[PDB]
């Protein structure tokens, strides 16, 4: 109904304004921390190195910024556009995740990227639906074996359907939410909370880019980098189901 | 269909490797240059400041890089707010749309924790509103087309082709209103190039949301209504991106 959708608009609007109030409250008091840290670094350096004027240190920092902004990395193997990192980057497009922790610097890069996505995203959506159906099949089938037990226990066939759906997501959650977060904690030296934050920002395809796992391979652990790609694929497919149903839940409400 | 799933996987896989080759070809040289420039900057500074070891300069740069990466600005030493009510509103929008530009990061663990639940609840809620607006926008467009469609049918062009021509006009005007119009708008408003603007538009409407380009984010602009109003466009454009793709899919099926 047109009347109802107007209502929905207003609700959302309120969901946004409410969000805004909370993020402002939680983040505004720390807006300025990074400046402060940069200035602390400058002042410390001047005190240690009397041959340097503040203004000269200023130019250095500008020149460094320009280079970093072009893709330079502070060094003390790190190419973001070598074959493996470019592969990953292409993934971040067709998934629509779009971390963006590495920017395109060329107009050709941008131009090509437009067509790459227009063609790539729908193509990927198709494969995702495919994997979603095939993965759900495997899950529901396994759960079906557990269902056999409930039905013998004379638990009503209606509840058995429900227990399976809870199981369906709960087991997925374990494999695609919980398992990875515990993995990343140890591998990335993130905190548990940072890891779950990352996981969820990823599987929702929000893809902020403040945290990114799989851009480069890890020596002494080869299986890591692919398993992450494999994970993103399977998890995104799982998360589709999660999202559709929370939606049905909301429609019911 | 198990055979097709495997074929599709191999295809995508090739679409990625092909992407990787192209992005590396288009971006690696620029990046390799930047890395060089950073090292030139270092070497130049050492030659001018004998009180500084290479290794000490290395640490300074790592520290500066971390701060810039946290959103410190090289130009100033220290008014405008990234988390003012309007920018936070916008930020919330970037979540539920799953666009996720990420040009301003959350710094607090509370911010992250809240963000998780905000999205889980926000995205499906939005998807519902989007489907709604998609149907309603297509309806209004389809009704408008009808009157001009009357003219084509009188001109004795077959009903099968008139349907096709109308689609061309249907998308062409949508495109005009939601792709072309905004890109021309942003060119003038943001001081981007035409190519940068289309790049931004499309990165946005695909929900990739890299974050290299963000309308309104510019600090200098005195433009309060601007940034939420842009969201008005985002709403209308995304739904149309959606609804059209959906109907196309149904026609294909």
């Amino acid at each position: 109904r047109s009347t109802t959708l107007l209502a929905l608009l207003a609700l959302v609007l309120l969901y946004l304004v409410s969000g805004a109030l909370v993020f402002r409250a939680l983040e505004q008091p720390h807006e300025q921390q990074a400046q402060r840290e940069l200035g602390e670094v400058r002042e410390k350096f001047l005190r240690a190195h009397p041959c340097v004027s503040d203004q000269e240190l200023g130019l250095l920092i500008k020149e460094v910024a320009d280079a970093l902004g072009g893709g330079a990395d502070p060094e003390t193997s790190h190419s973001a556009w070598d074959l493996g990192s470019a592969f990953f980057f292409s993934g971040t497009i067709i998934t629509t995740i779009g971390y963006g922790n590495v920017a395109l610097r060329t107009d050709a890069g941008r131009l090509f990227c437009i067509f790459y996505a227009l063609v790539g995203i729908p193509l990927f959506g198709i494969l995702l639906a495919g994997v979603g159906d095939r993965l759900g099949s495997s899950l529901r089938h396994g759960i079906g074996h557990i269902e056999a037990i409930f039905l013998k226990w004379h638990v009503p066939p209606e509840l058995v359907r429900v227990l399976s759906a809870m199981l369906f997501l709960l087991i997925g959650c374990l494999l695609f939410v919980l398992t990875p977060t515990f993995v990343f904690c140890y591998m990335e030296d993130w905190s548990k909370l940072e890891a779950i934050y990352f996981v969820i920002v990823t599987l929702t395809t929000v893809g902020f880019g403040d945290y990114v796992a799989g851009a480069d391979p890890r020596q002494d652990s080869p299986a890591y980098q692919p398993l992450v790609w494999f994970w993103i694929l399977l998890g995104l497919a799982y998360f589709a189901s999660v999202l559709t149903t929370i939606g049905n839940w909301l429609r019911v409400v | 269909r198990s055979t097709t799933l495997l074929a599709l996987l191999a295809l995508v896989l090739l679409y990625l490797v092909s992407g990787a080759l192209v992005f590396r070809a288009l971006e690696q040289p620029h990046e390799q240059q930047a890395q060089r420039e950073l090292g030139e900057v270092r070497e130049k500074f050492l030659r001018a400041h004998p009180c500084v070891s290479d290794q000490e300069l290395g640490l300074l740069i790592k520290e500066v890089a971390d701060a810039l990466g946290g959103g410190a600005d090289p130009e100033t030493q220290s008014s405008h707010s990234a988390w003012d009510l309007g920018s936070a509103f916008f930020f919330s929008g970037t979540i539920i749309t799953t666009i996720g530009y990420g040009n301003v990061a959350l710094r607090t663990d509370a911010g992250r924790l809240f963000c998780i639940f905000y999205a889980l609840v926000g995205i499906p809620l939005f998807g519902i509103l989007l489907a709604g607006v998609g149907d309603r926008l297509g309806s209004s467009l389809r009704h408008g087309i009808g009157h001009i469609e009357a003219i084509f049918l009188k001109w004795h062009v077959p009903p099968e082709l008139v349907r096709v021509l109308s689609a061309m006009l249907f998308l062409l005007i949508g495109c005009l209103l939601f792709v072309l119009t905004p890109t021309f708008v942003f060119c003038y408003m943001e001081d981007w190039s035409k190519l940068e603007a289309i790049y931004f538009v499309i990165v946005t409407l695909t929900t990739v949301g890299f974050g290299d380009y963000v309308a309104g984010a510019d600090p200098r602009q005195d433009s309060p209504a601007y940034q939420p109003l842009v969201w008005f466009w985002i709403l209308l454009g995304l739904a149309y991106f959606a609804s059209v793709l959906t109907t196309i899919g149904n026609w294909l099926r």
Partner: antibody
Amino acid sequence: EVQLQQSGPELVKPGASMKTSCKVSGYSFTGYIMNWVKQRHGKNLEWIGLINPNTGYTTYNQKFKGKATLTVDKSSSTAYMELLSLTSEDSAIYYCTRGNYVFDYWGQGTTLTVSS
Amino acid sequence: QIVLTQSPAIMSASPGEKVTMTCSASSSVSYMHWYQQKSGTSPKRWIYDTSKLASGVPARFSGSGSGTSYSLTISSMEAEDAATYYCQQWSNSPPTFGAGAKLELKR
């Protein structure tokens, strides 16, 4: 014993320019930033600019951008300041002083008098 | 660009008296430095980085403060302390000075 020895008082006509010096001893001239400061009689101190004796690099107070040129002679470890197009408001005491965050050593000052 | 205000610009103390002069900044700085000047002669670094004493300076002097508010204190005035004290900052280029606070002997 660090010491910055400034040259003597100078008296010049309005319009003319003037160059004054500061010879350092007791430390190595090229290791430290040199600044100049203006004190018009018994009033606020005003930073004019700095020079890096090692690199030649200079930066100035906006107030003094056109007015003052800083230079150094490395061999004689001496710093120079030229003031241009002098007017009456330039009459003051001028100091060379050392430092990149605090001014830890100062010359004894030199008095400029501008007058017809 | 950053402005430092020292107020009052004149004050007076008997010997033995405790003396406190303040410096308020137009916007926050990380450190404040102070000079002592006696008429006839150049300024001397007195206190730097807020609370560190230069070589010569006796212990009756101390400094403190933070952000936008800084102070110089004499626990117990002496006669040779009569002078003009200036604050200065260099957390932002260009460096800048307070307009000085003159401390005279009471009688």
